[PDB]
Design a protein around this ligand. Structure first.
Ligand code: NI
Lengths: 137, 36, 137, 137, 35, 37
């Protein structure tokens, strides 16, 4: 029985100056104990190797959209993976989901971030369109 | 990056500002260029 | 060892008055039981938490294409995840695969469906373009 | 206790009159044995069932881009999966990541290849843009 | 939905019938319009 | 791997595709090189 966490949106956040949009996460599935969503980040409590996966559903004409998944810890930021998607320029046609995943060594005390590097990104709060998850391997 | 470009943190590249002008909120560097 | 199922298409079917296309599945990899393909749906025999992944390869000019993966059981429907891809408008150019995945609690008796919510959708039968899989975690 | 291997690019290669581009891989996460990167392929030593995932990031106007992941062994190539993305024709806008994954029975002596079926393909060497991994299940 | 629009079950939202006049098979509420 | 004249078999799409679609690309397929030129 592997530890898992599957997270869906409660809300969006984007501050004025930043050129960044993030998602506030809430669990719909968990087993085992090594992880905890706190607002728009996930805290890592147990060191180990984890499968991390991220999907965001966009409805946004910005020529490219996507997300950047990182871990911060011990005074050091590292990008784990990015998903990038070209978008149609017509608002009514501009839908795309962006899915990426990988397996990474996360350490106790790390913070995982999921950032859309545009301000006020138009993205779905649907639990089946946008989500974020972990499996401890 | 050079004049009228921004460093796009998603693409890790320098991109012309005109690509972001007619689309929601452009990056902060670009905002002056996108008006006048 | 972990129980698994990897499925590929045998053919596609689209009902008349519905705006849906489904796939009939064949198993190419099986370890253990707990899951069983029955034509267009997958039956869950063993309750558990599963990694579920789904790819469909489209050759279709419809402005968006994609798939909806759902669970039906105990008198209820629930979408697990959606994949969405904007398509080019020129038929010679309009190719996109759409991949998504997540971890879900599946219960004995459940029925897993993969539905493309357009009629007579043009999707590949190739086992490496279109597929469906499960790993009990 | 699962064997894992996460790999990132060092460089690309493309033989003159072939219409294929490959990636020379370097391991950045490794646990257990059974898998060995060497150059643009991965050798399988321990027979078993593996999660295989692959992402490539493209900056290319070629009408479609993507990758074909295969195994070769006992004089027999088998395509495992492929990822396909339509690209914008405007070089300023032409960015897309292509992610796919599946679970497969890999045999001792197999060679795993990741091929982009275009010559001189413009793909990122960024470790968080283009990557390849394995988890023994 | 409004007139000359359909509920798209993929996108979970109302969409104009113009966007489905290229499709091999447009939805049924859309078919009279795409003539 | 065999198509009508002025097409190539695309090993990514596993389909016959007009050579015309690859003339904007940097390095066309070997068999298309004569058509694009
Ligand atoms: Ni295990």
């Amino acid at each position: 029985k592997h530890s898992v966490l599957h997270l869906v949106p409660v809300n969006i956040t984007s501050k004025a100056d930043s050129d960044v949009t993030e998602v506030m996460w809430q669990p719909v599935l968990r087993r085992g104990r090594g992880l905890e969503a706190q607002g728009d980040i996930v805290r890592v409590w147990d060191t180990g190797i984890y499968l991390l996966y991220s999907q965001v559903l966009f409805h946004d004409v910005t020529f490219t959209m996507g997300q950047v998944v990182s871990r911060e810890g011990q005074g050091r930021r590292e990008t784990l993976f990015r998903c990038i998607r070209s978008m149609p320029s017509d608002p009514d046609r501009a839908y795309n989901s962006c899915y990426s995943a990988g397996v990474f060594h996360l350490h106790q005390g790390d913070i995982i971030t999921v950032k859309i590097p545009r301000a006020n990104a138009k993205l779905s709060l649907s639990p089946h369109g946008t989500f974020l998850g972990f499996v401890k391997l | 990056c050079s004049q009228n470009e921004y460093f796009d943190s998603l693409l890790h590249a320098c991109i012309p500002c005109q690509l972001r002008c007619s689309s929601n909120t452009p990056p902060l560097t670009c905002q002056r260029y996108c008006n006048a």
